[PDB]
Amino acid sequence: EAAPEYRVIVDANNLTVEIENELNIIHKFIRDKYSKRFPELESLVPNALDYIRTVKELGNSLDKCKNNENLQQILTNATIMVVSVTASTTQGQQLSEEELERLEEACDMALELNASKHRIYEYVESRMSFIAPNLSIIIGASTAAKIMGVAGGLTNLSKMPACNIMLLGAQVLPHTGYIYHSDIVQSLPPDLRRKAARLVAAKCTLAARVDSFHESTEGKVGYELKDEIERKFDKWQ
């Protein structure tokens, strides 16, 4: 009916993935155009946001890795020692003001994207739990907004067999779709995934239907199915 809220969230959800891509790429750009000085650091901390965050501080002068305050609060202290040793055993040269200026500038970018990212996820997870509360409980805010994006809204999403629902937005890996790459599935031993998907797929089809008619608004059915699923995951190792 005109502008239906779901659409607004689907599109909203999408900017997050756009930003994953954008960050993923900014990651690669910084670790690269920085691996000129401290080329080793890359391999030391493999975590994007942290890395990007650190390299903004570290910067042009790399002495004093120990006892800095944000270098401290952004990093585990067990891994702040292992730098000062490979910081003295420096492996690269200082940077021009034109090569740094574009590194600092592309960090502020990284973080400012990251902010915007979370604060979009916050929006989607919220409104999603009002739109379709049970579906959400199982697979998650976003993934649920994705299956819905393409299904074209909770109504149709509902009238779909689980087999089809399972394959939503698939083309990397054959017959694996939004739910396969979901969070709740990927967090498993890879031999367990082709099964887990159909299990989750099918329960989602139940939630989806239950949400279609607006029952279990508090989220009951959702929580139940999510448990019946997690539990089967243990029995399964």
Binding site: K159, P161, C163, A202, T205, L206, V210, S212, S216, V221
Partner: protein, 128 residues
């Protein structure tokens, strides 16, 4: 006590005597390979417009997990009826588990044509 109180949304709900005829029919159509068992599987036969009728169990908890179906037999103008026991129904389709939805697929030159015929009329009768 009368268990005669089932979720009202489960409409129409077969007369005991009717309920027999379906299970019986369903049991046969299972043997003539004119039967599909399943929530999902029934939904398919609806869209592909090859179901004569839909039988659903009011047992079905939460009930909404199959309420999407009645709204679909409206579209495709297919008779649909609820029987009382998902468990009773499973056993009819020949399944050790409960079955909350089944469909009797269409098929040409099948002896159960007039049987299905009747069943259909009898369901029509309560939807009206």
């Amino acid at each position: 006590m009368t268990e005669a109180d089932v979720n009202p949304k489960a409409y129409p709900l077969a007369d005991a005597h009717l309920t027999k005829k379906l299970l019986d029919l369903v049991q046969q159509s299972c043997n003539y390979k004119q039967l599909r068992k399943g929530a999902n599987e029934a939904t398919k036969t609806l869209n592909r417009g090859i179901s004569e009728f839909i039988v659903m169990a009011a047992d079905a908890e939460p009930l909404e997990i199959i309420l999407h179906l009645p709204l679909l037999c409206e579209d495709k103008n297919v008779p649909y009826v609820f029987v009382r026991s998902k468990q009773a129904l499973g056993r009819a389709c020949g399944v050790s588990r409960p079955v909350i939805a089944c469909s009797v697929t269409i098929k040409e030159g099948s002896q159960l044509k007039q049987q299905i015929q009747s069943i259909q009329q009898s369901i029509e009768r309560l939807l009206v």
